[PDB]
Design a protein around this ligand. Structure first.
Ligand SMILES: [Zn+2]
Lengths: 50, 70, 191, 286, 318, 287, 85
């Protein structure tokens, strides 16, 4: 809990919403209070599953 | 030393705290909760109580920086 | 300047309420306290002087301090009624002199005895030999009435110190009317 | 008047460490200082304190003298840094007070209307909860003798607020805490009989001793009255105490039944879930 | 005084004990370890009476911790192979509330029982390895296991396997050291297996401990002995060439490369001669080498532990 | 010229005054002064801690009153121990105890009078109780930036001190500052009594008083408190008797929880407290 | 000449930064007070020893610390447009 606290202490963790997926392995992610972003793999989760 | 560890988990984060709006418990040890600022956050839940007082819809106190479920 | 800490003892015994000293022994010895406190002020600024009451149960009204305001404040409404106590009147001064900050300051005591004392000769000889080991020098000035041509106190001062020690001087007042400020003239010129 | 007092470990330590101050320089007597209390209700509370140089001559065995100017300056500093703190009385490390301590209170009674003196013990030995608390009152007497001032006992307890509990509990690193429900009540159960016995046994040896030596008074008056009060209770059946038997057991009736009620439930969840998680998890591995 | 005491170690000289007491009264802590270790070196195996009396009598009033540690290994080192003759002092060492003196009883009981499988020592040894508040004494407590049990290296991996999993890295460090010093004369693979996850712990210094321990298991043993030799040799250089790693952990990396390469690979360390008796310069050197942080010149005492392994066919004379 | 690992020896009396002076100042940062003795460069000890009076301007380099120091030092000279002051400490209640531009301004003032002058920060907030808490700092010389800044010797305590790192603000002090280790010393006699004082606090004075008052409690309203336990045992158990059936519906222990689950442990522990305090009756009331 | 030094000494007191205004929602315990800044965020925090719990009361405008986020001084009320009215 101490170490995990340290990784979530600075920025915490956000809540993403995928508006669209791209073939470049980069997935468009939109945050509600914020604008639209896009972020690359993410190898633990398969692209076809997104 | 385990009883002394309980004080290690109660030390964090102590005071002060920020109010947050709980959404739903996605899985064990972590759930998504809304900040009073309006930003929904993916948060690790404190280890002691994960269940009885969680409730689908309840106000919950979080840390300033981490926004951790306490 | 010479370093020392003086401790004055005002006489509140029930024999000091009479007006044999002009106008009264209360104001006579009060003016004596004024002249000695200003004398220590003109001597050294570092020397501090408290007061102690000998009669009844001895109590320190003012702890050792360089300012005389508190001393002059306690001289008033002192209610001088009680029995004189001597054997503990030197030891109280020594007791406040063991708590002193400065170790360079020598231990010095002045006291005014205006009433007869019941202290036996053996008690005073024990305190004489004790003050030799403690090196404490006490300068006494006898006031009021006592055994005619006071003896026990005189021999007490002589046997308290020796070689020289130049020393402790006991000035006995002669039985005659005079102003107090004129009685303190001889002790303030030379010990 | 005053009911009970609360003395923090911080101020208590502040007496002990000063005992280390005068310990190396010695020599005789005991540490004497002025206590700083905090009064929020009829219950009394102590937070900090300050030591004062004190020496008792022996000739003169009843001669006692304190520093008044130093008292003024130090109490003025503590009033400067803390407005809530004030002098509630004085303290000494004893271990046993002397007859001369009656006037010591009378001196500082000009500072505080009622000054409570607190004995403490720097070397823990016996017989239980430490320190002591005395209040200065005058009960006169039925004899019509001149008013005698005798200090009366005030119950003392060790406590703290928040931050003062931190360091105290942190520095021990010795015994389990607490632990409530298992080893908190049983250990104190033996403490009840042990601390009851030794208190009673030392004092009851005192009672037999008081009539042989220590007379006068001693006995009378306070002794015989409480004696008969001690003879007020035998104290058992006959009669109704016989009837408390089966209702005490009957209070145990439902408790044993509830015991056995949940004992089977513990064995239920444990054995069921474990035996499944044992054989059914091992069969997939091999 | 370290040169005088190491040169006269085991000689039981007299004049060295003279200037060592005035050096003990210099009151300086930086020379405290000098007087303390020298005093044990020259008196090694002599179980002197006034030596311990003066040392343990000087532990009280001194205000320094390095004089207390130097006297720790001092009174440890005078008492060698004395078996139960030293228990009378050991009782008083661990009963006392001084953290360093309880740390001294461990080294003392270590050298006095070296080569003995006496189980009477492991009762207090193990009990103090757990119930004690201080972490350094808990590390130095389990380091004694490899000193006494060096003759039977097969027991250490078994029994200490579970202590190597302890929650604090201090006991994990002592636990890696036990397998390091005890199994160094053997090619046991179980010890290596338990020292694999130790370098993976997120704690810094425990990884260092795994480096040196794994360096003692591989002395004179090439890749054909155990398959993890090259596995480890790439790790030693990897940790020292990465800037992100701690300087602490990368100290013991190059140090471990020095262990494997000691003497140009030609020499190794042996605590047990084939004759059946323990080699005291080896044991003494390594046991002082246990804590290299506290004094960096103490890392040179490991040179005495290096013994030549060679076949000498000298017929006679020159 | 010589830089080595350092160590702070604290007194049982010291910490207690630290956290107290710091608690009374919350939120506002206070100014304390550390008192002790310099034994050498690689070790230091604090044998005493005294509190400074607050000021309306706050923490500043001018907040130390020279006339107040000479007075207080008078009171400490006549005390058995007239030891020279060593350094200063200040509380940091609401954050992670980082040295600010006001702290550095008084660091260079203490480094000219005192060679070391260890900087100490104490806060009650960041720790419930059992933490060692506090902190300690030291000012490295800024004019040395051309030469090697990277000691020490005996790096053990250095490694344990710089850890955990532990966020960012903490790391922002690695430059221009370095911490210094803290370890308690005993003083185990007074510590032994200090344990028994708080523990005996829960115990009674005569010890037969509050236990017999719990015997007066042993039948109150305890038959009614046992009716409280009886309602918890009916109400929690008839809904915990559907759980063995529900385990067959979900198959088997997937999340969950409900709850409404367990809680009988606390009921059994309170009932056991009831039966033991009640078993004291036959011991006490009888003889 | 000396009045200027009086002003400059006032600057030394101006080295103390302000605080953030906030309204008292409720108090969970004596160590827990629920306060809400005018900006919208809520905070459960403590209080110092100068204030009284009875004098605070919910729905009271108070000033919170910049870091601890705790009450130091309070004000009864304020309103900026009315003065014009
Ligand atoms: Zn600051």
């Amino acid at each position: 809990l101490r170490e995990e606290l340290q990784l979530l202490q600075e920025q915490g963790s956000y809540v993403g919403e995928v508006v669209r997926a791209m073939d470049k392995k980069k997935v468009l992610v939109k945050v509600h209070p914020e604008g639209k972003f896009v972020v690359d793999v993410d190898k633990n989760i398969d692209i076809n599953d997104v | 030393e385990f009883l002394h560890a309980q004080e290690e988990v109660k030390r964090i984060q102590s005071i002060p705290l920020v109010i947050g709006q709980f959404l739903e418990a996605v899985d064990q040890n972590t759930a998504i909760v809304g900040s009073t600022t309006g930003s929904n956050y993916y948060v690790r839940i404190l280890s002691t109580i994960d269940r009885e007082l969680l409730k689908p819809n309840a106000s919950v106190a979080l840390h300033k920086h981490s926004n951790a479920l306490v | 300047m010479v370093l020392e800490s003086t401790m004055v003892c005002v006489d509140n015994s029930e024999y000091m309420r009479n007006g044999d000293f002009l106008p009264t022994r209360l104001q006579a010895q009060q003016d004596a306290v004024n002249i000695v406190c200003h004398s220590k002020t003109r001597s050294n600024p570092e020397n501090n002087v408290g007061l102690i009451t000998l009669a009844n149960d001895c109590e320190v009204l003012t702890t050792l301090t360089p300012d005389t305001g508190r001393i002059l404040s306690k001289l008033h409404t002192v209610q001088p009624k009680g029995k004189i106590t001597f054997c503990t009147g030197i030891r109280v001064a020594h007791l406040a002199l063991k708590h002193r900050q400065g170790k360079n300051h020598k231990m010095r005591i002045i006291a005014f005895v205006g009433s007869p004392v019941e202290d036996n000769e053996k008690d005073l000889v024990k305190l004489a030999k004790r003050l030799k080991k403690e090196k404490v020098n006490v300068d006494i000035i006898n006031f009021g009435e006592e055994e005619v041509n006071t003896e026990k106190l005189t021999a007490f001062v002589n046997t308290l110190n020796g070689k020289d020690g130049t020393g402790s001087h006991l000035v006995t007042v002669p039985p005659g009317p005079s102003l107090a400020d004129a009685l303190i003239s001889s002790p303030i010129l030379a010990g | 008047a005053v009911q009970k007092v609360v003395v923090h470990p911080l101020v208590l330590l502040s007496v002990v460490d000063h005992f280390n101050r005068i310990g190396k320089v010695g020599n005789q007597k005991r540490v004497v200082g002025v206590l700083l209390g905090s009064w929020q209700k009829k219950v009394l509370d102590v937070s900090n304190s300050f030591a004062v140089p004190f020496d008792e001559d022996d000739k003169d065995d009843s001669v006692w003298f304190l520093d008044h100017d130093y008292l003024e300056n130090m109490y003025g500093m503590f009033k400067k840094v803390n407005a809530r703190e004030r002098i509630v009385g004085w303290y000494h490390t004893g271990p046993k007070l002397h007859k001369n301590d009656i006037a010591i209170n009378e001196l500082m009674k000009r500072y505080c209307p009622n000054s409570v003196l607190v004995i403490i013990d720097v070397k823990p030995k016996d017989l239980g909860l430490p320190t002591e608390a005395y209040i200065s009152v005058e009960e006169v007497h039925d004899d019509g003798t001149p008013t005698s001032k005798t200090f009366e006992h005030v119950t003392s307890e060790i406590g703290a607020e928040e931050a003062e509990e931190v360091g105290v509990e942190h520095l021990l690193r010795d015994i389990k805490d607490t632990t409530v429900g298992t080893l908190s009540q049983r250990i104190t159960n033996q403490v009840h009989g042990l601390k009851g016995l030794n208190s009673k046994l030392l004092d009851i040896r005192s009672y037999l001793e008081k009539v042989a030596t220590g007379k006068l008074p001693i006995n009378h008056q306070i002794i015989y009255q409480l004696q008969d009060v001690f003879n007020l209770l035998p104290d058992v059946s006959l009669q109704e105490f016989v009837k408390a038997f089966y209702l005490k057991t009957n209070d145990q009736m439902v408790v044993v039944y509830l015991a056995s009620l949940i004992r089977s439930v513990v064995a239920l969840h444990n054995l069921i879930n474990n035996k499944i998680a044992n054989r059914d998890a091992e069969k997939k591995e091999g | 005084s370290l040169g005088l005491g190491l040169a006269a170690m085991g000689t039981a000289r007299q004049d060295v004990y003279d200037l060592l007491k005035t050096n003990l009264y210099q009151d300086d802590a930086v020379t405290g370890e000098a007087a303390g270790l020298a005093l044990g070196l020259v008196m090694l195996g002599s179980k002197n009476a006034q030596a311990i009396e003066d040392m343990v009598g000087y532990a009280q009033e001194t205000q320094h911790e390095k004089i207390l540690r130097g006297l720790a290994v001092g009174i440890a080192l005078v008492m060698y192979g004395r078996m139960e003759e030293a228990d009378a002092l050991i009782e008083s060492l661990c009963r006392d509330k001084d953290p360093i003196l309880r740390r001294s009883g461990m080294y003392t009981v270590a050298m006095a029982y070296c080569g003995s499988g006496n189980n009477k020592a492991i009762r207090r040894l193990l009990h103090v390895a757990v119930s004690d508040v201080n972490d350094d004494v808990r590390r130095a407590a389990v380091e004694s296991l490899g000193f006494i049990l060096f003759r039977t290296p097969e027991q250490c991996p078994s029994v200490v396997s579970l202590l190597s999993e302890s929650y604090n890295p201090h006991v994990r460090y002592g636990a890696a050291m036990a397998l390091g010093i005890c199994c160094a004369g053997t090619g046991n693979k179980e010890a290596i297996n338990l020292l694999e996850p130790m370098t993976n712990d997120p704690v810094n210094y425990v990884r260092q401990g795994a480096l040196i321990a794994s360096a003692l298991i591989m002395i004179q043993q090439t890749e054909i002995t155990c398959p993890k030799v090259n596995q480890f040799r790439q790790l030693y250089s990897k940790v020292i060439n990465d800037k992100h790693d701690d300087v602490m952990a990368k100290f013991g990396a190059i140090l471990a490369q020095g262990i494997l390469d000691a003497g140009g690979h030609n020499v190794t360390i042996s605590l047990q001669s084939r004759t059946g008796h323990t080699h005291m310069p080896s044991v003494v050197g390594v046991l002082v080498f246990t804590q290299f942080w506290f004094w960096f010149p103490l890392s040179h005492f490991l040179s005495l532990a290096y013994t030549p392994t060679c076949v000498i066919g000298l017929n006679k004379d020159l | 010229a010589v830089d080595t690992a350092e160590q702070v020896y604290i007194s049982s009396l010291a910490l207690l005054k630290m956290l107290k002076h710091g608690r009374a100042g919350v939120p506002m940062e206070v100014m304390g002064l550390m008192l002790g003795e310099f034994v050498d460069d690689y070790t230091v000890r604090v044998i005493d801690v005294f509190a400074m009076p607050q000021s309306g301007t706050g923490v500043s380099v001018e907040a130390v009153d020279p006339v107040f120091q000479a007075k207080m030092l008078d009171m400490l000279k006549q005390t058995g121990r007239p030891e020279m002051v060593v350094g200063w400490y200040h509380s940091h209640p609401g954050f992670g105890c980082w040295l600010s531009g006001v702290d550095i301004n008084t660091q260079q003032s203490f480094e000219a009078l005192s060679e070391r002058a260890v900087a100490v920060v104490v806060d009650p907030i960041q720790s419930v109780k059992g933490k060692v808490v506090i902190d300690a700092f030291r000012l490295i010389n800024a004019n040395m930036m051309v030469l090697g800044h990277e000691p020490r010797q005996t790096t053990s305590n250095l490694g344990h001190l710089n850890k955990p790192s532990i966020q960012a603000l903490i790391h922002g002090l690695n430059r221009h500052y370095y911490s210094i280790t803290i370890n308690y010393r005993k003083n185990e006699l007074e510590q032994k009594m200090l344990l028994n004082l708080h523990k005996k606090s829960w115990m009674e004075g005569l010890t037969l008083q509050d236990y017999s008052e719990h015997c007066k409690h042993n039948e109150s309203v305890v038959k009614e408190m046992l009716e409280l336990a009886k309602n918890y045992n009916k109400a929690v158990e008839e809904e915990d008797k559907m759980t063995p059936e529900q385990l067959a519906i979900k198959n088997v222990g997937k999340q969950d929880p409900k709850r409404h689950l367990e809680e009988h442990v606390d009921v059994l522990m309170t009932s056991n407290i009831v039966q033991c305090l009640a078993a004291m009756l036959d011991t006490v009331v009888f003889k | 000449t000396k009045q200027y030094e009086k002003s400059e000494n006032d600057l030394k007191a101006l080295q103390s930064v302000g605080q953030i205004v906030g309204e008292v929602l409720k108090q969970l315990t004596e160590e827990k007070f629920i306060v809400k800044a005018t900006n919208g965020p809520r905070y459960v925090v403590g209080c110092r020893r100068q204030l009284d719990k009875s004098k605070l009361k919910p729905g009271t405008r108070v000033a919170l610390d910049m870091t601890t986020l705790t009450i130091m001084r309070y004000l009864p009320r304020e309103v900026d447009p009315l003065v014009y009215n």
